[PDB]
Amino acid sequence: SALHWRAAGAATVLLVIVLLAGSYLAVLAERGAPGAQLITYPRALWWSVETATTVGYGDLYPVTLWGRCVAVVVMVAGITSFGLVTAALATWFVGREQERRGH
């Protein structure tokens, strides 16, 4: 088992973690702020997913300071995790291209 593949897995596990913790923390942070919509777990989990992937439709988003802070962690964990997979794929292509180079 290579580091990049182990890193991919780990990245995926930690991301699913951030998503769950993030969903829980967003609701905890938004309830109390009038006009807030990120206030029930099911949709918060949906919000966290569309945030980690950067799709951000705009149907949901935090309006409080703590919610936004939670949002930042989720964005970063998502961007960074997916970028990690990209780097793992680059390593896999490079390694095989060297082989095919008989190097």
Epitope: Y24, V27, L28, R31, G32, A33, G35, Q37, I39, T40
Partner: antibody
């Protein structure tokens, strides 16, 4: 079995204060929120506030005068609502309800009848 | 804060008729509306969640419909046991709120 247990009544002198309780049973998830609702005779349902025991955070209906203070005892699965310095306007039936964090009140207590009088 | 308007505060129907309760929101709230029944001296009881989802243990007689700002709670074929107060509640934005309620009369 009864998921939320509330005392039937509490008599309180104007100016004084009381602490209502709401003991719970059945499934309890970290995502549960306990709500409190006020109902004056004849009138409708008024939301007072909520509390999430697993964290202890509490929010209140900022539309009305803050008479309550919510707390919870994780160990005995009991939520408490302290009403302070009451007047006859505070006389009413006070309900507690459990929401699984998905927006609706799946279950309600029988409610505690509070009467403010000398 | 979201305002919930329950039209005729009182509704009169003959035994067996189909009856419809109205609930209107001051702004669009998707399907995040719930209905409760409260009989004389009883505590509220969930009947419909999310505008039209059935609740276990509730007569098939009851159903809900709508989305956006207009919601309806319907009772197909009214009967004595349905005499009570009916309330809607929203969970779309924060201060969860209740409608003023509608009394059913047969």
């Amino acid at each position: 079995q009864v998921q939320l247990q509330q005392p039937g009544a509490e008599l309180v002198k104007p100016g004084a204060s009381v602490k209502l309780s709401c003991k719970a049973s059945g499934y309890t998830f970290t995502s549960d929120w306990i709500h409190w609702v006020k109902q004056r005779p004849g009138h409708g349902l008024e939301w007072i506030g909520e509390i999430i025991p697993s964290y202890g955070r509490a929010n209140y209906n900022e539309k009305i005068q803050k008479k309550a203070t919510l707390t919870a005892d994780k160990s005995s699965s009991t939520a408490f609502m302290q009403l302070s310095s009451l007047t006859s306007e505070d006389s009413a039936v006070y309900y507690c309800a459990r929401e699984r964090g998905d927006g609706y009140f799946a279950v309600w207590g029988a409610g505690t009848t509070v009467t403010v009088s000398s | 804060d979201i305002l919930l308007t329950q039209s005729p505060a009182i509704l009169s129907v003959s035994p067996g008729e189909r009856v419809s309760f109205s609930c209107r929101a001051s702004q669009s709230i998707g399907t995040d509306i719930h209905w409760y029944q409260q009989r004389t001296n009883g505590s509220p009881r969930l009947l419909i969640k999310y505008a039209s989802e059935s609740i276990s243990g509730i007569p098939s007689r009851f159903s809900g419909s709508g989305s956006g700002t207009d919601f309806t709670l319907s009772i197909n074929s009214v009967e004595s046991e349905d005499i009570a107060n009916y309330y809607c509640q929203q969970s779309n934005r924060w201060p969860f709120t209740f409608g003023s309620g509608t009394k059913l009369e047969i």
